[PDB]
Design a protein around this nucleic acid. Structure first.
Length: 849
DNA sequence: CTCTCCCTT
């Protein structure tokens, strides 16, 4: 047992703390207490019966409305706006199947529609279903909710389906995503919404009484949300006999869903695309004759294949396929030669080059942009080159989507981002390296890693379509066909890699009280060790009690659209009055950093972050300083100038602000705040006291802790609370710094790539951890009196302080348990505020003098 | 000294 620094407190401070705690100790309507008591008291049969009654709206139809839309439908079909658009709609493959789909819905509870891009299922199947019910005179009874994996798709589709109906957005077609909507009309409407939007609406409507038809789109992606939603539908539909569900899927393991729901009917709808030719490694080396120089394993895979084809390819073609570096991206110059080949031969079209990561995209850009070979110096001015990456600005400007100036060919070097989320239409040529980067979690060592891996068969098929948008294209695969045979069908289903705390808690609101029972009934059941490791977290942070049942704090956390640890952080900041700095910290972790990392500017960006941190040694606070600067830049009308100098995305910043505004309004609604404004000065009085901000950021990220012992940029020896060596990720403001006020850090996400990295970090002080943490006990180790936290970091402390801090932690826990059952803002002058001031006092003693 | 990608009445 090794001892750390002295946390003991002055007598005048300790004397005052005791004066306050004992003021609080002298203290003596809640609808929430009853609601929480009721959710625990009801069994599942009763939970069902009640939610039927409260969502009764759809048992009521408006025949005068029915008659009116049946009549305005038949009438506007003789007009000249529709009847081309009805006749151009009939050009879609789906429209041939209109009639057979309706009959399948009438005759079956769940059906499955399997179709590839362009078959029109997403745009047409909702219109198909709705227009039958308008014509049969049912129009008011019909409400269709169609879930999408991505926000962009939810809007675009809603605007497209809307232009096709000769309406503005917001009449019969509407979209709903997080913090934005054009809602369609109450009845006779199609709403496109993200899968997450629907799961939250289930808390008020767990059995879906508020829709006639559900359409899950892009279930083949195995998004976490879709797999849970299908799993819930096994529990829902038995009590929803009149409900009609349309599952919708690409042609990727389509049978899994057909199997999952009984043997339910399946429709396969033929695609619309331009044909794209597939070439593989042998086909590439045959055209360009590119030559290589600067385990096996690999020999065992390729040698069987070389024999079967030996007379289809030149012996110097087959001979090159023996090299481990011919497949994937290992030789970048090779991929450079192919782009150079496609520019010399071949028709005009854009080139899409899929490469695994940032590092590799930079490699090819620098080969293309400042080329050393003679062939490249020829082409350099004739290529218009965009890197495309989620941390790079390119996707947020119009440049990469528009076609290049005459006499130039547009060449994108991209990650997996251009596979779905971002779509470039003039791409006729796709170079698929077959390599990407993936996160993997190892339950045994509790290390998440990001490794370079081969893509799967489904990845390859989907990357091919991205060239078939405009004209017949080509897909160039840089791995052999024999390699494709060792590739998986699909990537690992998302639920199998993800932290389970947030779900397990959410299911409780739906009266699913045993997560091991439910989550096992999914298409893929998670590892049950991961559920446990998850329920064990929800017990630690006191959302579930030791028996595993929801606590009053737990019912709140499951009601907030953020992971359980930070929803609590946000609650702490309501009571401790740091709301604006904290909800910035929270929303940045839930979503993402505002900073771009454009190519070549890396050192310049670390400078902007270091200056934005204001030497606060906090990445989380660093983002908040950025938002404070952003809000002034909107006040100074300087906004664009601002985001350019600091490499910031104003699209992302507006979202963080929108999230923060949400957290405010939920807290104000839950009776934890007096104003729904996260800038309200009443709610922020403590928002400047940096030791307090670190104290809540600690209360939020605990138990993720790190310990720094070294010196020198500088060299760091730091270990996490488990003993494994870690370093600040090079993008964290804290990499390479020296001179920290404290050697202890809290972190959100730990990750191994080339080293064990902490991705973002906040320096905290021992006294703060010990208050808000757990595993606090006092004793004597040698002859030294100590105070520790988590039975790991033991600090020197004298006894008058231990007895007071330990008495302080009791009165804090008592307060929290009460504020959760009986929500109310802490009165500024009341008894509860007294305990707050006691903690503000103690934490303030760490201030930088 | 480095960064695959979605997303939550």
């Amino acid at each position: 047992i090794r001892l750390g620094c002295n946390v003991s407190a002055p007598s005048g401070v300790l004397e005052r703390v005791k004066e306050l705690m004992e003021d609080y100790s002298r203290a003596p309507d809640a609808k929430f207490q009853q609601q929480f008591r009721h959710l625990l008291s009801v069994n599942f049969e009763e939970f069902v019966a009640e939610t039927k009654e409260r969502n009764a709206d759809l048992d009521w139809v408006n025949p005068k409305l029915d008659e009116r839309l049946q009549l305005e439908l038949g009438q506007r079909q003789l007009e000249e706006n529709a009847k081309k658009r009805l006749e151009a709609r009939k050009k879609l493959p789906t429209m041939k199947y209109a009639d057979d789909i309706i009959q399948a819905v009438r005759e079956n509870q769940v059906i499955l529609i399997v179709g590839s891009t362009g078959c029109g299922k997403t745009t047409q199947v909702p219109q198909i279903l709705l227009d039958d019910a308008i014509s049969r005179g049912c129009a008011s009874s019909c409400r269709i909710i169609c879930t999408q994996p991505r926000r962009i798709s939810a809007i675009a589709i809603a605007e497209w389906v809307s232009y096709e109906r000769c309406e503005s957005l917001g009449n019969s077609v509407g979209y709903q995503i997080r913090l934005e909507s054009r809602k369609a009309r109450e009845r006779a409407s199609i709403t496109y919404c993200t899968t997450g939007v629907l799961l939250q609406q289930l808390q008020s409507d767990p059995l879906m009484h508020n829709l006639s038809v559900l359409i899950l789109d892009e279930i083949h992606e195995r998004s976490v949300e879709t797999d849970l939603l299908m799993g819930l539908l096994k529990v829902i539909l038995p009590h929803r006999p009149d409900l009609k569900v349309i599952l919708m899927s690409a042609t990727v393991r389509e049978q899994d869903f057909c199997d999952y729901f009984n043997n339910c009917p399946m429709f396969r709808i033929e695609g619309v695309m331009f044909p794209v030719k597939m070439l593989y490694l042998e086909d590439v080396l045959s055209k360009t004759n590119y030559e290589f120089q600067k385990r096996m394993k690999h020999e065992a895979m390729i040698e069987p294949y070389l024999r079967r084809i030996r007379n289809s390819y030149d012996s110097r073609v087959l001979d090159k396929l023996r090299l481990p570096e011919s497949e994937g991206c290992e030789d970048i110059d090779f991929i450079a030669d192919l782009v150079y080949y496609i520019c010399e031969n071949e028709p005009e079209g854009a080139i899409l080059v899929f490469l695994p990561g940032y590092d590799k995209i930079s490699q090819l850009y620098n080969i293309l942009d400042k080329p050393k070979t003679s062939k490249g110096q020829r082409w350099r001015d004739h290529m218009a080159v965009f890197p495309l990456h989620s941390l790079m600005q390119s996707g947020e400007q119009q440049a990469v989507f528009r076609r290049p100036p005459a006499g130039q060919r547009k060449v994108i070097i991209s990650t997996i981002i251009a596979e779905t989320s971002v779509t470039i239409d003039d791409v006729v040529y796709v170079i698929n390296s077959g390599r990407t980067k993936a996160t993997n979690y190892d339950i045994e060592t509790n290390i998440q890693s990001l490794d370079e891996v081969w893509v799967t068969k489904a990845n390859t098929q989907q990357r091919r379509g991205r060239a078939g948008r405009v004209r017949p294209g080509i897909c160039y695969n840089l791995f052999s066909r024999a390699r494709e045979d060792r590739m998986d069908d699909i990537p690992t289903p998302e639920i199998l890699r993800s932290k389970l705390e947030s779900i397990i808690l959410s299911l409780k609101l739906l009266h699913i009280d045993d997560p091991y029972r439910f989550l096992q009934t999914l298409i893929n059941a998670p590892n049950p060790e991961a559920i446990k490791m998850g329920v064990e977290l929800l017990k630690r942070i006191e959302a579930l009690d030791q028996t595993g049942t929801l606590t009053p704090l737990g019912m709140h956390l499951a009601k907030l659209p953020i992971d359980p640890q930070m929803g609590k952080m946000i609650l702490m900041s309501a009571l401790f009055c740091c709301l604006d700095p904290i909800t910035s910290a929270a929303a940045a972790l839930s979503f993402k950093s505002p900073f771009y990392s454009p190519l070549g500017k890396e050192s310049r960006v670390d400078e902007i972050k270091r200056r934005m941190a204001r030497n606060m040694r906090s990445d989380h606070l660093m983002v908040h300083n950025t938002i404070i600067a952003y809000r002034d830049s909107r006040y100074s009308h300087a906004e664009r100038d601002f985001c350019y100098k600091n490499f910031l995305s104003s699209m992302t910043l507006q979202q963080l602000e929108r999230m923060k505004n949400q957290f405010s309004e939920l807290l104000y609604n839950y009776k934890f705040l007096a104003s729904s404004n996260c800038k309200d000065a009443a709610s922020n009085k403590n928002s400047e006291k940096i030791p307090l901000l670190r104290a809540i950021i600690g209360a939020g990220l605990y138990p993720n802790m790190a310990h720094l012992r070294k010196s020198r940029r500088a060299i760091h020896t730091m270990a996490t609370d488990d003993g494994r060596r870690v370093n600040f990720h090079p993008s964290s403001v804290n990499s390479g710094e020296s001179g920290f006020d404290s050697a202890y850090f809290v972190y959100f996400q730990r990750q191994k790539s080339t080293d064990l990295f902490l991705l973002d970090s906040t320096m905290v002080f021992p006294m703060a951890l010990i208050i808000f943490g757990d595993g606090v006990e006092a004793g004597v180790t040698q002859n030294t009196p100590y105070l520790c936290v988590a039975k790991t970091y033991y600090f020197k402390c004298n006894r008058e302080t231990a007895d007071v801090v330990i008495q302080l932690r009791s009165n804090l826990e008592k307060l929290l348990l009460k504020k959760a059952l009986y929500p109310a803002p802490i009165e500024e002058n009341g008894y509860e505020k007294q305990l707050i001031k006691a903690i503000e006092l103690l934490l303030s003693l760490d201030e930088r003098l």
